Amino acid sequence: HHSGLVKMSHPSGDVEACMVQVTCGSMTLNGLWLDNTVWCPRHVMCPADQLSDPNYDALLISMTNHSFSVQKHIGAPANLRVVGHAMQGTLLKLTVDVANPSTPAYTFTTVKPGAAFSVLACYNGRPTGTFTVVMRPNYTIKGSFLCGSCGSVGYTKEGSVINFCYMHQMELANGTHTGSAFDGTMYGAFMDKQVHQVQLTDKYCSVNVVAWLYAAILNGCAWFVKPNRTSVVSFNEWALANQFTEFVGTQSVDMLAVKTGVAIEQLLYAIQQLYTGFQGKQILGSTMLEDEFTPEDVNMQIMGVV
Amino acid sequence: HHSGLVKMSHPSGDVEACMVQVTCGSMTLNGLWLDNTVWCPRHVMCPADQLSDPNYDALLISMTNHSFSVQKHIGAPANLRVVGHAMQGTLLKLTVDVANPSTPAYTFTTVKPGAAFSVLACYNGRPTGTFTVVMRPNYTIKGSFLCGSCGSVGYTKEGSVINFCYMHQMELANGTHTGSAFDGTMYGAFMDKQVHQVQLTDKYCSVNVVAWLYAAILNGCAWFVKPNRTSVVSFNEWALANQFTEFVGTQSVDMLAVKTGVAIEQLLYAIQQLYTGFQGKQILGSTMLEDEFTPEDVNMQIMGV
Ligand SMILES: *[C@H](O)[C@H](C[C@@H]1CCNC1=O)NC(=O)[C@H](CC(C)C)NC(=O)OC[C@@H]1CCC(=O)N1C[C@H]1C[C@@H]2CC[C@H]1C2
Ligand SMILES: *[C@H](O)[C@H](C[C@@H]1CCNC1=O)NC(=O)[C@H](CC(C)C)NC(=O)OC[C@@H]1CCC(=O)N1C[C@H]1C[C@@H]2CC[C@H]1C2
């Protein structure tokens, strides 16, 4: 029985209309055009033979407004005149002379570990694909990014408001990815320089495992549900010792509990048993715990609860 | 020998000139006035009897511009006219008809666990104290806040640019505090409602313990340094099993290693042994590891960088 769960992204059309190509000298990557501002990764300023130890302060100083070229390729093409430039953290903030007429209602936020967001992968300012990832507890994402993808954007949607949360910056040694929030900070402890970096230990996202067990129950699969319970406080002491994130309940999880009649504490107990082995059985076609679906994913896709 | 380390905050004058009082009905707290915007916690709109599960969307729809009173008390006082209101996550964005003429150069940023920032504690729109804190690994701070302190702001300073990183929201059950970034998200998993909340477990900030051990070496207190080394990788596996954050080196830490000639890996080994007990000895007057001073504190206050 198919769970009815897929990796679902937001429709990308509103964000496609904001993607541009940014070029600074011999370097090029993607930018995001909103109102009179274009955001892009600051390493567009760095000469390719200097990516290991750039002085971004001096690089910024060395630029003028004419150092940047911004092009919209898709839809109505445009070449945007830069009238101002500023650096914020790991991003450039370029001020352009024309406000994007396709600017959607938007906000900037930071995504938290375990939360899901949609990514619009772009090359040379052209959107090429979309996918959705969960921010891992070690502040990487398991994305799909090649050379030239920097400046690809990640976002969520609340109603018609797009919340931009990610600008792609780099690939780590283990093949995962990270980037910047739009306040310019890099997720995690990573730096935007081409050096090998300490990447931290990942964990199972316990709230998302709970959501997936609820998805299994909503599909008629409940062999792992026993009357036994583990309290949140006790589960969280156990989680610290067994590479799980600590569980924090939300209204979204509570809705799944009410709809199924299975208490959160029953699933916390189940996770502790299932972590020691599935005993030859499967849950939603898997023999391992799944933490890439959120409580909101489960509520929206199975129950239609936005 | 006194190390020369103290808890050092930025001078607060530039930020005090941005502080206002925000009142909505019978609720009052502090706000931050930058350009034509006043930021403040959204629970200023919530009646005191409804704080345990506010419908903030409905509260916001029910307000008008006239629901808010904004006053600047210190310096050149003013009662500001509110001409727009909006909500961004856990913060209200009030638009006022006058741009703050004392608006400093500023950015908004999020502070990371282990990093230090300065807090201007305010009551009724009036600055009353300043102190510095480190963001804990569980996204709380060990602050000093009483009723009426919400909207107090935390910040760092890079040159003449103020980087606002914190707006105060709540006290947790264990006496620590948390707040919002200026994107309106709460630090950590906390929600701005008056209910019991899961508090995640705190950890030692390994990078700051390393800085403090370098401060001891710079002060001549080096009895804990041995030839033995622990690699960053092996230390980080041990840290996961011992309530420490994983270590990530920075240029600030490297500067301390070059100055003392003691390798980071020698101090990682030391931390592992010291954590089991100081064997009756002291380091910089302490019998336990200290993680409230950053590599940058040590570079500035001891090496004068
Ligand atoms: C920007 O488009 C690009 C995205 C990555 C390219 C491959 N997949 C991506 O997600 N970002 C970068 O190339 C980074 C630039 C830095 C931040 C200034 N660097 C980066 O991701 O580095 C990855 C690894 C780390 C070790 C290393 O030498 N290296 C760089 C290789 C990988 C890419 C091909 C040749 C260079 C870039
Ligand atoms: C705003 O000025 C104020 C600041 C705090 C007042 C005391 N010191 C502060 O730092 N913030 C609030 O009053 C919060 C409003 C919420 C966000 C809507 N509430 C708050 O901080 O509540 C604190 C109390 C006392 C200590 C504590 O753990 N706690 C929360 C309650 C809720 C659960 C029941 C008992 C505890 C846990």
Exposure of A193 by Cβ count < 10 A (0-12 exposed, 13-18 middle, 19+ buried)? middle
CA pair distance B291, B214, nearest whole angstrom: 12
The per-residue DSSP string of A68-118 comes to: EEEEE-SSS-EEEPEEEEEEETTEEEEEESS--TTPPSEEE----TT-EEE
Cβ atoms < 10 Å from Cβ of B6: 11
Beta bridge partners, A134, equal: A116
Q: Which residue has the tokens 């909101």?
A: A296
| Tokens at B247, concatenated | 């270590």
Closest residue to A185, CB basis, from B109, B198, B249: B109
| Tokens at A52, concatenated | 């290991």
Cβ atoms < 10 Å from Cβ of A269: 21
Residue type, A139: Y
What's the longest Cα–Cα distance across chain B?
68
Q: Which of B18, B150, B205, B221 is flagged as catalytic?
A: B150
Which domains are present in chain B? Answer: 1-16+105-202 (2.40.10.10), 17-104 (2.40.10.10), 203-305 (1.10.1840.10)
Cβ neighbors of A222 (< 8 A, separation 6 or more) are: A216, A262
**Is B24 among the residues known to form the active site?**
no
The whole-angstrom distance between residue B257's C-alpha and the CA centroid of its chain comes to: 26
Cβ neighbors of B147 (< 8 A, separation 6 or more) are: none
Q: How many residues does chain B have?
A: 305
Nearest residue by C-alpha to atom 25 in ligand 2: B171
Say which ligand is closest to the CA of B168. Answer: 2
Phi and psi for B204 in degrees, rounded to 5?
-70, 135
- The answer to whether the CB of A194 falls within 8 A of the CB of A52 is yes
Relative to beta strand A37-41, strand A27-34 is antiparallel
DSSP state of A125: T
Helix (H), strand (E), coil (C) string for chain B: CCCCCCCCCCCCHHHHCCEEEEEECCEEEEEEEECCEEEEEHHHHCCHHHCCCCCHHHHHHHCCHHHEEEEECCCCCEEECEEEEEEECCEEEEEECCCCCCCCCEEECCCCCCCEEEEEEEECCEEEEEEEEECCCCCCECCCCCCCCCCCEEEEEECCEEEEEEEEEEECCCCCEEEECCCCCECCCCCCCCCCCCCCCCCECHHHHHHHHHHHHHCCCCCCCCCCCCCHHHHHHHHHCCCECCCCCCHHHHHHHHHHCCCHHHHHHHHHHHCCCCCCCCECCECCCCCCCCHHHHHHHCCCC
**CA atoms within a 13 Å half-sphere pointing along the CA-CB vector of A63:** 29
Computed over its alpha carbons, how large is the radius of gyration of chain B?
22
- The answer to whether the CB of B192 falls within 8 A of the CB of B169 is yes
Phi and psi for A181 in degrees, rounded to 5?
-75, 170
Computed over its alpha carbons, how large is the radius of gyration of chain A?
22
Cβ atoms < 10 Å from Cβ of B42: 22
Cβ atoms < 10 Å from Cβ of B9: 18
- Ramachandran category for residue A189: left, alpha or beta (phi over 0 → left; psi -120 to 50 → alpha): alpha
Cβ neighbors of A287 (< 8 A, separation 6 or more) are: A278, A281
Q: Is A297 helix (H, G, I), strand (E, B) or coil?
A: helix
Nearest residue by C-alpha to atom 21 in ligand 1: A170
CA pair distance B112, B129, nearest whole angstrom: 23
How far B297 CA sits from the closest chain A CA (Å)? 19
**Cβ(B140) – ligand 2 distance below 6 Å:** no
Nearest CA in chain B to A246: B200
**Is A1 among the residues known to form the active site?**
no
Which atom of ligand 2 lies closest to the CA of B170? 21
